[PDB]
Amino acid sequence: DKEFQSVEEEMQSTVREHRDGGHAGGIFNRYNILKIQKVCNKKLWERYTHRRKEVSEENHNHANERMLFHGSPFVNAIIHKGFDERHAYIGGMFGAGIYFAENSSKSNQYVYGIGGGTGCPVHKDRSCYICHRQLLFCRVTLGKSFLQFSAMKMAHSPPGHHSVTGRPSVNGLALAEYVIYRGEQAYPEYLITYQIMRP
Ligand SMILES: NC(=O)c1ccc(I)c([N+](=O)[O-])c1
Ligand SMILES: NC(=O)c1ccc(I)c([N+](=O)[O-])c1
Ligand SMILES: NC(=O)c1ccc(I)c([N+](=O)[O-])c1
Ligand SMILES: [Zn+2]
């Protein structure tokens, strides 16, 4: 209903023009939203809320929950098993965490692998306008989030913190990114099936 409409609006309005000129994610200004499904995995939801309650107790009764995008070739494993820090992006700017973006076009750069990988499996095109892509729109508990501008290779959250917020800087980050170090600190709420569209 209006629930899915607000997801599509969030998806469309957070697109940015990327500095790599579309190298990783493709050349587009909008998507063709094909499908939006709400993921209902009861064991995952309980694992997520149990940790959410715990983080709230450690952050002045505030979870600091945000709706953030995740792009990955492992969407199906995430949907069934949940996010898993044992599969963290080690090559990441903030070390061994699970990365999220508030810009859908940033998470779109990661759907086929790091830097878009080799693109779609059928045409090997990072800018494929034919193949259907999937992105997750997630509930992410940031708790007490550590604000950082430069690269900091963490294995875990910094002491007394529950996440890292990568803020844009000149050297530096173009857009924000959010890093959790425990899989249970995110729930894959919505599965968005989409195509990027030729401008
Ligand atoms: N997707 C959700 O926000 C959500 C809310 C409540 C539940 I009980 C579940 N669930 O996956 O079982 C999901
Ligand atoms: N790399 C993998 O085989 C893999 C398995 C499970 C997961 I939850 C992930 N993951 O990075 O989302 C990756
Ligand atoms: N490991 C991933 O799939 C991944 C890595 C970095 C990022 I910035 C994202 N992301 O969706 O924002 C995902
Ligand atoms: Zn393709």
UniProtKB/Swiss-Prot annotation:
- What about PTM? Ubiquitinated at 'Lys-48' and 'Lys-63' by RNF146 when auto-poly-ADP-ribosylated; this leads to degradation. Deubiquitinated by USP25; leading to stabilization.
Domain of life (superkingdom): Eukaryota
**Where does it live in the cell?**
Cytoplasm; Golgi apparatus membrane; Nucleus; Chromosome, Telomere
- Where do the annotations place Zn(2+) binding? C120, H123, C128, C131
Expression sites (tissue/organ): Highly expressed in placenta, skeletal muscle, liver, brain, kidney, heart, thymus, spinal cord, lung, peripheral blood leukocytes, pancreas, lymph nodes, spleen, prostate, testis, ovary, small intestine, colon, mammary gland, breast and breast carcinoma, and in common-type meningioma. Highly expressed in fetal liver, heart and brain.
**Domain PARP catalytic positions:** 1-199
Main function = Poly-ADP-ribosyltransferase involved in various processes such as Wnt signaling pathway, telomere length and vesicle trafficking. Acts as an activator of the Wnt signaling pathway by mediating poly-ADP-ribosylation of AXIN1 and AXIN2, 2 key components of the beta-catenin destruction complex: poly-ADP-ribosylated target proteins are recognized by RNF146, which mediates their ubiquitination and subsequent degradation. Also mediates poly-ADP-ribosylation of BLZF1 and CASC3, followed by recruitment of RNF146 and subsequent ubiquitination.
Q: How does it assemble?
A: Oligomerizes and associates with TNKS. Interacts with the cytoplasmic domain of LNPEP/Otase in SLC2A4/GLUT4-vesicles. Binds to the N-terminus of Grb14 and TRF1 with its ankyrin repeat region. Interacts with HIF1AN. Interacts with RNF146; this interaction leads to ubiquitination and proteasomal degradation. Interacts with NUMA1.
Q: Please state which protein family the record places this protein in.
A: Belongs to the ARTD/PARP family.
Supply the name of the protein: Poly [ADP-ribose] polymerase tankyrase-2
Q: Which gene encodes it?
A: TNKS2
Portion of the full sequence shown: 962 to 1160 of 1166
